[PDB]
């Protein structure tokens, strides 16, 4: 019975990694964009041999920003908890492939050496982690929340001569902040917020992450 | 003020009503003066005064 | 009223008064003799206004509002009314009266705190001591709030104490970090705004394209020779023609961006100036008389306005940030500019002449310039004093509620010192949940969902339970469950020679077991999925009279030989019955899953300013619907239910707006909340300051409670 | 945890600053009723209500470790006195604050510890009413409990 | 014809289901059979459930139950004479029965008691007095709060929960 | 059996050992197939009369005609009524009252006692 929620759910946060991948610039298909409930549901063909491995085959690739500097790649582990074993695989699975970023979607939660391990990664490759819960709905569309966009350094380097601050000086962010996730950025990349303002209708901002 | 027909009276003839308060030029026209004309009010005589 | 109320009174012990919505019977009683009494004091007191004579020099220090006012008139005139404490009428001292010169259990008017006189009369005994208890509430109130009133200010003022504008006008703390780029978001004083009304909210597009546009193909009434005078010569131009085609391009370009900017569809905000004033000023000196023709020059109007537009200088600079910093900042100010000195707003209604509309530009600069915010400024301590002086301003624990629901969203200063010290814990936490348009406007889809979301646990939908000793179904010593048990003959046919002689019997309560529109093969599967494959369950049918649940518990079968002693410490399974009892019943958590406690009281919302939406014809409107108010806190998952509204759905609790939307988030819901208590009173404390207080604990990602 | 999934039956008494809690029954064996009947006799002589009875049935199941009245006793010191060796003056000062704190208004003699078991079974009694629903909570305020 | 078969459980489950049509024998007045349609019935089940698990065994007992009922042999005659089709029988998709006289009416009275559930939580501040000057209505919240006061008097503030306006008395 | 039933199956709460005095648990025989009362510190042991070992909940067990004493009749400050007919005597004047207890039995209905020595009797209406 709760088999058939899932079919929503995996259309679902399909769908929210496809406007993840697309704020984030990597060029999805607009059809993937507009794709259905009932197109995605034809495209699994729904109701067949259950619990089959659909997420192995919804493992996607994602095809560059302005400038083609190889990919991003998404990866949905079948297992409810992701060990390293399943990681380790995986990397040797990223590896092959020459990939550059990986995002890997668990359903329950990571082990924690695993999580080192992640931690580890960060030299090469970058993995990036979403609980599937808070991925599974779209934040960024939520009205307490305004436009977020990310800033090249050159940007902020201008930022910072044209009202002569200091990096240090600015608004903080956490790492782990939700939108900062959502974009997956690092440490010393500034954010514009822009926000709707009772008083100046719209109001500039600019956090440095912390 | 309480006077009048709140909602309705003013749109009825406009029979000046003497109730709301009109001054032109530093020289008060008609009405009456209260707390809201006078008191801590956001338009209050006082406030635009100053 | 009073043969009302005991008329009232009459219909509750009959036992048929059919009770109001989420309430106990006493409650929908109690609800109902206060509308009474309230209705009956009011009713009086219009009666004894009315009947004042126009010499009542009490009428005229009410009237002035020198000092008392229209309830005062009511107590000494008229009835004084029920008195009440802690928001209840007079509570029951000794056993079940209020004072022993009553009979017990009494809820007449007078015998429960209802005063009948009026001062001028003089209270009867009773109601004196009624009275005198009424008092002390206020002087024990008064007592408590001046001393943490007091706290909450100091450690308020303390925290903000460094903040200040610097001389390129970004305010900044003690560290010199950066709390605003331009300070309150615009650089203008507190002193010098004022309220206005925003012209362009105009409902109706045709409305609003018929009052604004600078018509061309000229109807009838007077060839441009009316109103204006020498313009009928500048109706062949092209150029003028094109210049005002593209200022009311930009109008609705404006509008559009107003209307996003404002979706509730309130044209009250603070400006400075107040540019109709102004041109009263401007109209009522050069002695412009409206019925003579004009003398002004349309292209003089718009470029005019272009040329303000710069002299309006906020941001100096020149790169393109500075140019945009600007831009932005004043964008508020700028589309009210234009919709004021609108030329064919200018022409019609105002009628100024060209030396007036000079002058009056001339001004307008000289005032805004003033109004820019002098840098230096304590602008951190001047917010501290601002928003502590509400908190001196009314209300502890009193009960003015009329969100015809539960107390939530406790009110006043308690609520206040929970947003100061961001509670981890808050004492009363909520969340309200608005649904998808569909399942809106329709209620049996709306008790769909919000069975989804409530969460209850089997306790509650269980009528009794027993436990039983028959190690033999087929023979059962309840007979009437009898004929199941040959239904079950082939449900495991053999592993009933294996499976333990005790049983446990549920029975569930009908209507709420309905209500929850639960089916049976979703409890058999959910107790089998906690407890597991062991606990071997069979039940009857959804509409047997009776609606019955048998549970009976199954072992490992063949490892089970006795092998060294049961690693168990052999324990009989009766009591272990009691303890899946116990367990099967605190666990099991079907539907919701987790802490919203009880989880509902559903609402129709017609009253507030919910739903409001854009129209064709370009005006807005009203959208009455339901919409689900909880008293819990999950956002995280609730967000991600079916049908649960993804943009609108919010919760008062801070701590798990900052889990789920981040810091930005919380720097909104914040000010939301911030503004929602002081807003109670409605003396309406001015924006800019809220904006840097939630600046200020915002400022650095974590949250930064003043603790 | 897997015991029995109730802890809203589990009566206990504070004694005097006695460094640990006790269980009632425990605290009736030590006055020397250790018949089960007896002790229930005394918290409630009208058993004609099974709902009561069995509300109080798992502490008599807790208390079932002990049955004598001396072991109660060096039960009580040891939940009571610090750490030692001897039995028997543990079991003797157990004793005397037993029969001397408990309740010193019913009484401070040997020779009047029953009637001092009957006001503790009162009480009891006085509580489960309370926990049942059949009685009302007592005011905190109530004049009529001030001097 | 009645679809071929061979699993012993499947037999069993076909002989109770006809069992269960052999219930006051009204089978006998109308003269239809049992074991074909009963058969039949069992026949679509299976094509819904595709295997004898238990939720298939949960369906079976379920129309079971319904042949079974003493308050409505009126459902088991209908099926009987065939004004219901097996294959609607075998999905209770199409509700549950209504023709026992007042279960039926009572989980309508349950639909009413959550709706009334619904009604208004409990609706307030009416008094009703001043008429807006915004949305022209009349429908009107007044509050009372500060006594006496330091030196801002017990004035009247009066809110239009309407539109969330607020005005003072004077 | 029937909808218009009952259940008090009767919840012997009470059956200490003739013996010492003590409380009887279940435990199972498994040679006669048959529940069984034991003492736990003694061999005694006597079969059930019942096959119920524990209840909980009736929910309803509104409790509207039990625990209320006659004797509460005599309470000056119970309202008297000139409402008529004790349900058994034939003689009017009855005191009333209601609830009088914490499971806040959303009871507002009232409960009627007579008050002359005849009856005693205990009614609701
Ligand atoms: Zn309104
Ligand atoms: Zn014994
Ligand atoms: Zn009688």
Redesign the pocket.
Same mark, same amino acid.
Request: glycine share 0%; aromatic share 14%; proline share 0%.
């Given at each position: 019975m709760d088999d058939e929620e899932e079919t929503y759910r995996l259309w679902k946060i399909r769908k929210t990694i496809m406007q993840l991948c697309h704020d984030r610039g990597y060029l999805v298909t607009q059809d993937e964009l507009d794709q259905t409930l009932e197109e995605f549901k034809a495209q699994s063909g729904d109701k067949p041999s259950e619990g089959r491995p659909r997420r192995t085959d919804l493992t996607v690739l994602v095809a560059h920003n302005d400038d083609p500097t190889d990919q991003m790649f998404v990866f949905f582990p079948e297992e409810p908890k992701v060990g390293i074993k399943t990681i380790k695989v995986y990397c040797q699975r990223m590896q092959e492939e020459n990939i550059t970023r990986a995002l890997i979607v668990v359903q329950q939660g990571m082990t924690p050496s695993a999580k080192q391990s992640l931690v580890d990664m960060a030299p090469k490759y970058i993995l990036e982690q979403f609980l599937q819960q808070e991925l599974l709905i779209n934040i960024t569309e939520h009205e307490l929340v305004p436009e977020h966009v990310v800033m090249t350094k050159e940007e902020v380097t201008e930022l910072l001569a044209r009202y002569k601050l200091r990096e240090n000086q600015l608004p903080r962010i956490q790492a782990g902040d939700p939108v900062a996730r959502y974009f997956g950025i690092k440490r010393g990349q500034v954010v514009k917020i822009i926000r709707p303002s009772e008083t100046a209708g719209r109001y500039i901002t600019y956090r440095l992450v912390q | 003020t309480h006077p009048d027909d709140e909602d309705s009276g003013p749109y009825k003839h406009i029979s000046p009503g003497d109730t709301k308060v009109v001054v032109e030029n530093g020289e008060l026209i008609m009405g009456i003066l209260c707390k809201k004309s006078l008191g801590t009010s956001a338009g209050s005589l006082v406030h635009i005064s100053y | 009223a009073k043969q009302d109320v005991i008329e009232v009174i009459e219909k509750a012990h009959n036992n048929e008064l059919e009770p109001t919505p989420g309430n106990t019977l006493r409650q929908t009683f109690e609800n109902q003799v206060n509308r009474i009494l309230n209705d009956a004091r009011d009713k009086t007191g219009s009666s004894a206004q009315k009947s004042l004579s126009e010499y009542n020099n009490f009428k005229s220090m009410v009237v002035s509002g020198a000092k008392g006012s229209k309830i005062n008139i009511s107590q000494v005139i008229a009835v004084v009314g029920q008195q009440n404490v802690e928001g209840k009428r007079i509570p029951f001292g000794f056993k079940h009266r209020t004072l022993p010169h009553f009979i017990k259990d009494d809820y007449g008017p007078e015998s429960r705190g209802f005063v009948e006189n009026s001062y001028l009369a003089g209270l009867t005994p009773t109601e004196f001591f009624f009275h005198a208890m009424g008092g002390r509430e206020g002087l024990i109130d008064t007592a408590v709030k001046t001393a943490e009133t007091g706290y909450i200010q100091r450690r308020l003022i303390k925290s903000m104490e460094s903040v200040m504008v610097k001389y390129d006008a970004t305010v900044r703390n003690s560290i010199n970090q950066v709390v605003q780029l331009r300070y309150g978001e615009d650089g203008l004083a507190g002193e010098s705004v004022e309220f206005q009304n925003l012209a362009t909210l105009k409902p109706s597009n045709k409305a609003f394209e018929k009052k604004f546009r600078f018509d061309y193909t000229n109807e009838r009434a007077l060839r441009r020779t009316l109103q204006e005078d020498l313009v009928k010569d500048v109706l062949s131009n092209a150029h003028i023609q094109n210049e005002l085609e593209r200022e009311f391009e930009r109008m609705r370009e404006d509008r559009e961006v107003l209307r996003v900017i404002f979706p509730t569809g309130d044209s009250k905000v603070v400006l400075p100036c107040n540019l109709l004033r102004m041109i009263w000023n401007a109209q009522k000196i050069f002695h412009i008389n409206p019925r003579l023709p004009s003398d002004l020059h349309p292209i003089k109007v718009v470029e005019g306005v272009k040329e303000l537009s710069k002299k309006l200088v906020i941001v100096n600079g020149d790169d393109p940030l500075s140019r945009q910093a600007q831009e932005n900042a004043t964008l508020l100010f700028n589309i009210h500019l234009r919709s004021t000195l609108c030329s064919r707003r200018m022409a019609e209604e105002f009628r100024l002449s060209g030396e007036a509309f000079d002058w009056l530009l001339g001004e307008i600069e000289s005032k805004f310039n003033q109004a820019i915010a002098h840098p230096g400024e304590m602008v951190g301590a001047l917010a501290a004093q601002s928003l502590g002086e509400p908190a001196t301003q009314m209300t502890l624990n009193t009960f003015h509620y009329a969100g015809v629901s539960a107390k939530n969203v406790t009110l006043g200063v308690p609520r206040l010192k929970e947003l100061i010290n961001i509670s981890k814990k808050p004492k009363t936490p909520s969340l309200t949940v608005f649904l998808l348009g569909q399942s809106a406007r329709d209620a049996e889809r709306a008790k769909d969902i919000l069975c989804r979301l409530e969460h209850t646990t089997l306790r509650k939908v269980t009528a009794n339970t027993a436990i039983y000793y028959d190690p033999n179904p087929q023979s059962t010593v309840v007979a009437e469950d009898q004929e199941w048990v040959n239904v079950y003959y082939e449900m495991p046919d053999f592993d009933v020679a294996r499976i333990s002689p005790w049983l446990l019997r549920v029975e569930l309560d009908r209507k709420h077991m309905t209500d929850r529109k639960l089916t049976m093969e979703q409890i058999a599967e959910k107790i089998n999925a906690g407890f597991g494959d062991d606990l071997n369950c069979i039940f009857n049918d959804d509409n047997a009279e009776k609606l019955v649940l048998r549970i009976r518990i199954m072992n490992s079968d063949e490892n089970k030989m006795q092998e060294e002693e049961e690693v168990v410490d052999k324990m009989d399974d009766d009591v272990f019955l009691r303890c899946i009892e116990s367990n099967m019943l605190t666990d099991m958590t079907l539907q919701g899953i987790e802490q919203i406690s009880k989880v509902y009281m559903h609402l129709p919302q017609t009253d507030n300013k919910k739903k409001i939406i854009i129209t064709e014809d370009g005006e807005f409107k009203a959208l009455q619907e339901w919409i689900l108010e909880t008293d819990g806190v999950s956002l995280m998952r609730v967000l991600s239910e079916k049908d649960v509204d993804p943009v609108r759905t919010t919760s008062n609790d801070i701590v798990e707006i900052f889990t789920v939307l981040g810091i930005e988030a919380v720097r909104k819901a914040l000010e939301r909340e911030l503004y929602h208590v002081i807003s109670f009173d409605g003396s309406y404390v001015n924006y800019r300051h809220l904006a840097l207080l939630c600046d200020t604990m915002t400022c650095r990602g974590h949250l930064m409670a003043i603790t | 945890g897997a015991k029995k999934s109730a802890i809203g039956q589990r009566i206990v008494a504070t004694l005097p600053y006695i460094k640990q809690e006790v269980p009632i029954i425990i605290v009736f064996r030590a006055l020397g009723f250790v018949s089960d009947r007896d002790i229930l006799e005394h918290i409630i002589y009208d058993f004609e209500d099974p709902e009561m009875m069995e509300m109080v049935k798992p502490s008599l199941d807790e208390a079932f470790v002990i049955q004598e009245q001396n072991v109660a006793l060096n039960f009580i010191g040891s939940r009571g006195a610090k750490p030692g060796v001897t039995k028997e003056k543990r079991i003797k000062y157990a004793k005397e604050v037993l029969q001397k704190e408990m309740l010193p208004h019913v009484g401070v003699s040997d020779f009047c510890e029953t009637k001092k078991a009957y006001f503790l079974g009162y009480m009891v009694h006085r509580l489960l009413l309370a926990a049942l629903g059949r009685r009302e909570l007592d005011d905190r305020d109530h004049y009529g409990n001030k001097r | 014809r009645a679809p071929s078969t061979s699993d012993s459980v499947r037999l069993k489950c076909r002989e109770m289901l006809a069992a269960a049509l052999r219930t006051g024998d009204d089978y006998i007045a109308i003269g239809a059979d049992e074991e074909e349609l009963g058969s039949q019935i069992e026949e679509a089940i299976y094509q819904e459930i595709r295997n004898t698990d238990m939720k298939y065994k949960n369906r079976v007992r379920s129309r079971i139950s319904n042949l079974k009922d003493a308050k409505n042999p009126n459902l088991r005659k209908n099926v009987l004479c065939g004004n219901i089709p097996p294959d609607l029988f075998a999905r209770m998709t199409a509700e549950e029965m209504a023709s026992d006289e007042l279960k039926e009416m009572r989980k309508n009275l349950t639909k009413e008691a959550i709706r009334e559930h619904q009604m208004a939580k409990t609706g307030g501040t009416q008094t009703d007095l001043f008429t807006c000057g915004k949305c022209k209505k009349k429908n009107c919240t007044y509050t009372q709060v500060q006594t006496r006061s330091a030196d801002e008097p017990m004035t009247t503030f009066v809110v239009c929960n309407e539109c969330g306006n607020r005005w003072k008395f004077c | 059996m029937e909808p218009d039933g009952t259940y008090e199956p009767g919840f012997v709460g009470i059956r200490?050992?003739?013996? *010492? @005095? @003590?409380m009887?648990y279940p435990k199972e025989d498994k040679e006669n197939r048959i529940l069984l009362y034991?003492?736990? @510190? *003694?061999?005694?042991q006597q079969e059930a009369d019942n096959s119920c070992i524990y209840v909980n909940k009736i929910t309803h067990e509104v409790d509207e005609l039990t625990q209320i004493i006659a004797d509460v009749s005599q309470d000056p400050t119970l309202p008297r009524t000139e409402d008529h007919p004790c349900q058994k005597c034939g003689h009017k004047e009855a005191v009333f009252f209601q609830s009088h207890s914490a499971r806040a039995e959303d009871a507002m209905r009232l409960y009627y006692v007579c008050t002359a020595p005849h009856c005693g009797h205990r009614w609701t209406e």
């Open positions: - | - | - | - | - | 200490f050992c003739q013996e *010492c @005095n @003590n009887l034991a003492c736990r @510190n *003694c061999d005694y």
